[PDB]
Every structure is written in C-alpha cells, then in structure tokens.
C-alpha cells in the first residue's frame, strides 16, 4: 500500500509492521515496500536524526533487497551521512 510516503517519519511505521523491534525479519515482502520507497526516495538529513532512521541503515545493510546493492546504496547514503562528514558536492 501507499505509493509515494513521501516523508521520513511515515516510512519508520511501515518498518516497524514489517519486523521486530529487535531488528529481525517477521515479513521480507513488506520490507521490500520500504526499501523500494527508499529507492524512490531518500531520507533528509534532520529528518534521519529526528525519527531515527540510521537504525534502517544497520538493517537494510545486512537485509536489502540485493547484498551487491548494499555496495552500491553508499552513494545514496553518503548523501545522508553529509551530517558526520562533508558530503554535498551536487545534490544541494
């Protein structure tokens, strides 16, 4: 369900449902709705502080969608990590 979350806090909820507070997987077909949200769009930098989303970081590094992709998302990420260090180079 949902197409477009749109924003950061939204995105938590549909984590939580998908598995356990503990960090292990109840439902991968409900996680997959997460990640491919993620893919169409990035978590912002106050907003990944706020609702806490660098625990999705630990999560989806072990349990994304492709292990070779984990690799790739670091590009994406350090969009992200520009808060601990200097990353904006285009996407400003």
Known sequence: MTAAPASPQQIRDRLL???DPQSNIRNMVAVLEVISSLEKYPITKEALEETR????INDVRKK?????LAKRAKKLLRSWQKL?????????
Do not use: S
């Open 17 to 19: 449902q998908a598995i």
């Open 64 to 68: 994304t969608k492709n292990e070779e």
């Open 53 to 56: 989303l660098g625990k999705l």
């Open 84 to 92: 601990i260090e200097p990353a904006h180079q285009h996407e400003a």
